[PDB]
Design a binder for this molecule. Sequence first.
Ligand SMILES: O=C(Nc1ccn([C@@H]2O[C@H](CO)[C@@H](O)[C@H](F)[C@H]2O)c(=O)n1)c1ccccc1
Ligand SMILES: O=C(Nc1ccn([C@@H]2O[C@H](CO)[C@@H](O)[C@H](F)[C@H]2O)c(=O)n1)c1ccccc1
Lengths: 811, 811
Amino acid sequence: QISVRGLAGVENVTELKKNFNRHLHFTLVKDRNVATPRDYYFALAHTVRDHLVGRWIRTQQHYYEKDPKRIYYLSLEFYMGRTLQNTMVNLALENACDEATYQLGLDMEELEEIEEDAGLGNGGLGRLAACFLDSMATLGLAAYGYGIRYEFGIFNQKICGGWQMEEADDWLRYGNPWEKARPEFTLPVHFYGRVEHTSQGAKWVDTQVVLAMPYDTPVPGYRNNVVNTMRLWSAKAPNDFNLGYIQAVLDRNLAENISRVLYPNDNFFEGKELRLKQEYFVVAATLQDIIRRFKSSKTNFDAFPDKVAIQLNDTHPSLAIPELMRVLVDLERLDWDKAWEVTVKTCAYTNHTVLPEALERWPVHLLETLLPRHLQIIYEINQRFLNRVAAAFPGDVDRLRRMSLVEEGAVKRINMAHLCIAGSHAVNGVARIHSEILKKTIFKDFYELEPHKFQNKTNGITPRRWLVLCNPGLAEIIAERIGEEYISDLDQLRKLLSYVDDEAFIRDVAKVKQENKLKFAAYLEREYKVHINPNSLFDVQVKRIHEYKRQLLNCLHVITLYNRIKKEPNKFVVPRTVMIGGKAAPGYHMAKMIIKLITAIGDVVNHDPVVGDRLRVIFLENYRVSLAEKVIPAADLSEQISTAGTEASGTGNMKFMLNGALTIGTMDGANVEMAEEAGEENFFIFGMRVEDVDRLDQRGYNAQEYYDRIPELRQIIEQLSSGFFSPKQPDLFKDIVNMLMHHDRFKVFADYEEYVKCQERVSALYKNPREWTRMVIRNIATSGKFSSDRTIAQYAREIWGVEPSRQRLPA
Amino acid sequence: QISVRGLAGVENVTELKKNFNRHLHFTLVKDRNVATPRDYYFALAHTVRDHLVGRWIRTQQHYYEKDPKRIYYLSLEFYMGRTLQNTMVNLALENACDEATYQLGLDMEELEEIEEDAGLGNGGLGRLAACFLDSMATLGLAAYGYGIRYEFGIFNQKICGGWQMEEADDWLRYGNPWEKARPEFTLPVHFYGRVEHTSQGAKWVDTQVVLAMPYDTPVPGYRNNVVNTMRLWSAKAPNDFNLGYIQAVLDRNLAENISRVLYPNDNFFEGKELRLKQEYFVVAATLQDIIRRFKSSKTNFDAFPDKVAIQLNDTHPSLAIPELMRVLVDLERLDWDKAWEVTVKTCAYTNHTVLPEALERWPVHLLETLLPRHLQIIYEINQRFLNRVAAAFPGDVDRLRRMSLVEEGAVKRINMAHLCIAGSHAVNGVARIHSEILKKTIFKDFYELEPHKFQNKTNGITPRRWLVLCNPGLAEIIAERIGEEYISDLDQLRKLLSYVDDEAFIRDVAKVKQENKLKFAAYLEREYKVHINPNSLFDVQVKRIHEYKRQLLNCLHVITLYNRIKKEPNKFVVPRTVMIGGKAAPGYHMAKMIIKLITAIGDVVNHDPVVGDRLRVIFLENYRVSLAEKVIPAADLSEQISTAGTEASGTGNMKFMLNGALTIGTMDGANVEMAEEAGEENFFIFGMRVEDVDRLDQRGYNAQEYYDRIPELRQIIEQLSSGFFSPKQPDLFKDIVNMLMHHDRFKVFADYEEYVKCQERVSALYKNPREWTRMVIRNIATSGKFSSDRTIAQYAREIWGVEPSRQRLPA
Ligand SMILES: O=C(Nc1ccn([C@@H]2O[C@H](CO)[C@@H](O)[C@H](F)[C@H]2O)c(=O)n1)c1ccccc1
Ligand SMILES: O=C(Nc1ccn([C@@H]2O[C@H](CO)[C@@H](O)[C@H](F)[C@H]2O)c(=O)n1)c1ccccc1
C-alpha cells in the first residue's frame, strides 16, 4: 500500500501464507473452523519470529568470532510495549504480511491489537532502556540488555467512579511467543549468611540459594540483519528447598516471589526488602554471566575493561560495583587495588532525577542481614574514598561528612548515588540543563574532586517505533520528498526546511494530522463510547501522575476556560479537546486525588449545555506504550509544564515534536534543547526559569499573594473549596486546596498567569491553519537531534570506547 | 532392526531428518555446534508430536460429527511416565526415528533417557488410569481423562545414609512438549460463601473465585489413528484478586496453590483442607466442561445419561454427585427427583481398597465452611436414601445407623464411599476376590438393598507399554511365531502353549531374559556404581512401601538365607540378587524404618567375605514408571506377598507375568485369577487364605507363639534387637521388633514358615533352567486375560453402555 512499509513480492507472500497455515495447524493445533482472532495473531507472530531466528543465531556467532568489546546495559525496567509490528518494520516485512493476511481473509491491524504490551517499566526510565536497545542493534553494537522477567508488569488502570483502580497485569497468561527459555544457563544467587575470615581471605558462608533462570528475547536492528539479545532473569527455588513435606513445597513461593512483580513507583524511593532482593538478584546473575562469557572468549582481568562495559541505568543496579569487587577479590584472588582499577574502568552511571525523595538510601541494617559481605566491601570503598577527599581538601571536615557513602543519623543509610560516582569512570545526566545542575548542586563536591568523570548525554527516542510504526502516513509524505535514509539518520529531516513554503507539502502535513485525529476519535467511541469533536484542538498531557509534572496547572487552565465561557457564552472561542492520561503509584494519595479532580471537572464541563462541543475534558484510561502510539500522532498541542529544574529530560516531549504537535512548555529538561533546535519563535515557552525558582525560594514562596492578586484564580479556588465540582461531597478536594495554598513544593500559582496568557497565543495561531502547519513543519524538520541513534553514538564514543557501524550483516 | 518396531522407509526417514533439523533451528533456536543431548531430545519430541496433530484434530472432529456417547474418566492421579517412546510405538514410527537419528549421528535410546516422567500419581490407582486411557483410545471410545496438572508430582526419592530423603519433582522445568495450554477454555470455580434462600430456590453467594485453566495432552490409540484427550486443570487467580498493592499480587499464590503438588499418600486418608479444595476444583471445572460440550452437541437433560458417562476413580472425585445435583437443581431448575434420576444413571464408582484408614471421611465442619451448598445437598440425599432403607427393612434401627452417609461421633463426618454407592448406578471392585469381599463385608448392607449395582471388573495393564515398549526382544520372538495381532488382542498369547516343548522357542525365551538381565546389571553399575552377578536369580519386590504389602516378610527371608550361609558356608546355594524398591509416604514412620532396615541388611550382607556373590541385597532408589520399564523385563521372581484380603487387585503382578518372571504369592487380589489362568502348578502359592486370616482373628493373633516355636525366627528377632544390623545404634530397630511382637495387623510371623519353604521350591526349580523356562512359557501364554483392553471392553459393555471398535480412522 505505502512505500516505507517495504515490498510485497509474490514469492514472499506465498511463503508467508504457507508458514501461517503451518503454525495454525502444527503449533496452535487448530483448524480454520474453530480458530479465533487470538489464534490468528499467534499464527502470525510465530511466522514473523521464524524470520528472526537465522539472523539471531548468526549475529551471536559473529560476536564470538570477531570478539568485540561487549556492552551490558543493566536496568530494573524495560518498557518494551508490543513486538509484532516493530519486528515487521525492522525486517521490512510489513507490506508482505499485510498482503498475505489480506489474502487469507484477515485484517492485520485487528490482529495487532490482540498482543499484550510487555509493560516491564513505569515510564521514562524504562522506555529509555527500550529505545536504547533498538538503537544499539541498529548501530551494530555487541549489546545485551539485562533485567528481570516480572510475571506482573505495571498494573492495568481502570477508572471507577472517577477513581483509579489497579488490576494485575497478567501479561503472560496466553504465552509469550517472542521469548526463549534457557534453563540450561541457570545460575545460583546467594542471600543472607555470614562472613568467615580465613588465613586466605573472606568467605561468605551459610547462605540461602535462589536460582536465576534466563529468558532471551531478540532485539532486531533496522534492516541491517543484526539481532541482539535482551536476557531477563526469573527466580526459581532449588529442588531441595526447605527439604512437613507439603508446606515445604508450598514455601518455594517465598524464593520465587523475587521476580513476581514490578514495583510501581516512578521517581520515588521505598526501602522495602523485596526490592533490595530484586536489585541484587539481577546484578549477581548478570555479573556471573558476563564473567562466564569473558572467560569463554576468543585468566587476564587487566584486559576485562577492554572487553566489557557495564552501564548502570540509575542506582537500581548499583550493587554491581561491590559485587564485581567481591568476585575479583574473594573468588579470583586479585589484590584490592587492581580489582578497583578494573571495576572503575568497567562501570558507568546514568542519573535520571534530582528529586531528593527518589534517591536510593538503603538502611545499613537491611544490608547487614541480607548482604553482609557487600556491606563490608562498601565500608572499605568509603574509607579509601574519604582518604582521597581528605588529601585533596585537607581540614575540610564538612566535605567529608557530605561526600561519605555512609549517611549518619537516626537510621544509618548507604547513599547509592555516592557509591555509583565513586565506582564509575563516567557519570552522566540526561539533558544539558540537568547535567549542569548535577555539577552545580547535588554532586558539586564530587565534581570538584573528579571533574573528568562528569558528562552529558541528552536523551532521545527511536524513530522506528515513534515515527515509522505509529505514524506511517507522516513517514510516507516525508519519504516522498527526501527518500528513506532519514529513518536511520534522522538529522536528514533538516532537508524539510526547504518545503516550509511548499503548498503541496503544507496540505499533506495537515491532511495526515486530520486523518490521525479522525482515527483516534473513532478509537475512543469504539473502545470507550466517548464522543469528541475531531475539528477541535487536541490538547494532550500524557505521562505519569506527579505533583512536579503539574497536571494541576493544566486543570487550573481548563477551569479558567470553562469559567470564561460561562461568563460570555456567545463569544467565539477556539474549540479544544483536553486529554490527560497517566497512572498514579498505588500509595501516592495526592496523585490519586488529582485523577479524581480531572474526572470531576469532566463531569461538569462535558454535560454543560452552554459549553456545547467547544470544550471537552477526557481522562485517558490505562496510558501505556500501545496507547502512546495512538494518541501522540493525533495530538496538536503537547503539554510539557514541569516546574523549571524538576524534569531531568523528558522523552514524551520528543515523541510529540516528531509527530507534528506544537509544544507549550517551561524551560525544563530537554525542552530547552528542543526550543534551541527549532527556534524559540517556533515554541510556546512560558514561566519561571530555574534562576527565577531559586530567587522565589530565597524569598519564600507565598501562595496567598497570588490568590489575593488574581481574581480568576480566586474564583477557581473558591469553586474547589465550596464543592462546585463535588456537590455530593462538598469537601472532597480540601487536601488539594490545602496543598496549593500552604504546602506547594512546585509553585503552581507562580506560573498560572504566564501559562494562561501563553495558552491564548496558542489559540490565536490555531485560528490560522496555514501558519500553524508551517510552524509544525519547522518543528518536525529540526527534531533530528532527538533520535536515540545520536544518543547511543555519543555513549559509544565518549563512554564505552567503541565505534558504531551502519553496515549490514549478510542475510 | 526388529519387526514389531515397524518400517523404516526412505521417504519417511528423509522427512523425519529434515523436520528434526527444522525444529532444532526454528523451535529450539540452536545450531549443531552448541546443541546438547537435551536439545536433541526436544527436537525429536517436537518432530514426533507433529505426527499426532492431524490425527488429533480429525479424531475430535469425528466425535463432533458422529456425536457418540462420551466417557469421562475422573481421577486425581494419572501416572503417565514418559511419552516419547509410547507415541512412536502407537504411530509405528520407532524404526523410522531410530534410522533417522542414527543417520544424524545420534543414539535414540540415549535421547529417550532425557525425558522426565510425568509422575502425576502415587502407584497402582494412578497407573491404572494411565493404562485405561491407552486402552480406551485403542478401542475407539470417545473418552476423556480429566484431572489436575500438578506443578510437582510424586517426590524424587534419594537414599542418604540408608534413609529416604524427599526432593521436589520439578518435572516442568525444561517445558513439556506434549501439552497444549488452552487458556481460551478457562472456567470459574467457587469456594466458601453462603446459601441464600429465595422464592425461586437456593442461591450460593459471596463466594471466592479461582480460575481453572485446561492443558490438553494427546492420547494415541495403537495404530488406529485415534487420538483422544487428557485434559488437566491448572489453578489461576482472577486479575482483580485481593484488589497494599504488592502484597495483594503476592497473595495470588494462595489461590494457585490448589494445583501445586500431588499429595503423596498411597492407601491412606489425610483430611487436609487443601486436598478437599483439589477434589472440588477438578470436579467443578470438569462438570462445567461436560455440560458445555453436551449443550454444544450435534435443553433436554433426560437424554443426558444417553450421551454422558462419568467414571469415578475411587471416592476422590465423589463431589461430582452433589455438584451435578447442584447444577441441575439450582442452575437448570430441574425438580429434585428428575435431577437424581439423571445423576444416578450418569455416575459409576470404582472402589480400590478395603483398608479402613484409606477411606475418605470428611469432617462436616470443613464442608460447612468450604462448600455450604454441597453439605445441604448431601444431607438431603441422606434423608431420602435412609427413607428407602427404612421402608425396605422396617424397624432395623442399627442398619439405618450403619448405612447413613453422615457418621456420628466426636467429630461428625461424611462417608464418601456411602455417598458414591447411593448416587451411582454401578459400583465395582477391581478383582474377583475383592468384589466378593465388598458384598460380604464392608458394603454388605448396600448390596442387600441394591444387589444389581454391584459388579466386578478385574484390573489389567496395557500390553503396549508393558510388553512392546519395555521388552521388544520378547515381543519380537513372540511375533516371529504367531504374528503381530496379539498386541491388541492379547488372548492370542494362548497360541504359545503349542511351543512349550519347542527347543528353539525355549532357547529364545531364555536368551531374551539373560539379555534383559545383562542390560539391567549394566544400568546399575553405570548410574549407581552397584555391582551384581547377572547369573544369579533376580528376586524382585517393587511397589509402594506399606505394612500390608509385607516388605518385612521378604526381609525375614533374606536374613534367613544369610544365617543359613553363615551356618554352613561350604554348602551350595542358588545365588540370588534380592532387589526391593518403592517410595514411602513422607509422614509414614514405619515405612521409613522399613527402608532403613533393607539398606542396613545390605550393608551387612553385601560386605561379608564368606557370602561372596551368592547373596546380594539392593534397594532400588526412586522407583517410578521409567524404572519399572527397566527392572520388570529383567526379573526372574515376582514377590506378591500381601496378607490375604488386603491387596484389592495389584497390577505390578500382571506386568511381571507378561515379562517372563515366575510369581511367589499369597492368594490375594488378582494373584488368585492369575494362578487360575496359568494353573496352580505353574505358580508359587503359599500362606494363609482369607478364611485362615479370619479364623486367626477370631482366636486372637499371638506373635509370641511363632517366636517360641521357630528357632530360626527367634534368631532373627534377637539379631534385630541386639544391634547386629546397627552396631553404632543398637536399638535402632526397636520400633520394628515391637510392632512385630505386639501390634502386627498383618500377621508377618504367621506366614513365615510356609514362605521360607515355598522359597526353597523356587530355588529347586531355578537349578533346572529348561524346566524353569517351560513354566515361564506357561505363564506368558496365559497372561492374556490381564490386558486392560479386556478390562475396558467390560466397563464399556456392562457399565457405560457403549461398544468398542478396533476399526481404523482414515490417516
Ligand atoms: O526516580 C526513580 N525513577 C525514575 C527517575 C527518573 N525518571 C525519568 O527518566 C527519564 C529518562 O531519563 C527522563 O526523561 C525524565 F526526566 C525522568 O523523570 C523515571 O522515569 N523514573 C525511582 C526511584 C526509586 C525507586 C524507583 C524509581
Ligand atoms: O486408598 C488410597 N489410594 C489407593 C488405594 C488403592 N490403590 C491400589 O489400586 C490399584 C488399582 O486398582 C490396585 O491394583 C491395588 F490393589 C490397590 O492397592 C492405590 O494405588 N491407591 C488413598 C486414600 C486416601 C487418600 C489418598 C489415597
